[PDB]
Amino acid sequence: PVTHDLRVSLEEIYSGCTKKMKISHNEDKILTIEVKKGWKEGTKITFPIVFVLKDKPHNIFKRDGSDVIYPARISLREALCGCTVNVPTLDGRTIPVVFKDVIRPGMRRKVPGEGLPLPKTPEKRGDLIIEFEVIFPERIPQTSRTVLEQVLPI
């Protein structure tokens, strides 16, 4: 009744992949493992041994079921005065997504259909969620404080 962790990258989950696994008991044998589109953490593939699919951490995206989250690290200036976010896609395109209104700390903007394939309807994808991280200045001179007091509301 034996489990071993099968680590799968976001890209593997987006497109599917085949994974080959070596064993010894004492004959060296190969178990092959089709990983179909959009399969979730925990998914069990058993072998008369139980491979349990784990999401490999990715540094651009955080998986949220079939959705994919994108941290957008912008300046406070960008957040107050406007900016363009070049959203990366899982297949390596970039989408400019223009923001005219004030962006708020932790604000989300759904980029529809740029997520993972939903396992059972893999022609239907989840979403890419922009998640804004507004980076404050470490320090503000007395010069700036005095202007900021005049132009920002009480």
């Binding site: 680590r7 080959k20 064993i23 060296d28 190969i30």
Partner: peptide, 27 residues
């Protein structure tokens, strides 16, 4: 029971062994 991931390349070479072993034991 020792398990470990293989590359496409590693995996081929290792079948050529369980094969080129089931060759000797098929004698």
């Amino acid at each position: 029971p020792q398990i470990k991931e293989l590359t496409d390349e590693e995996a081929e070479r290792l079948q050529l062994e369980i094969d080129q072993k089931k060759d000797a034991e098929n004698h």
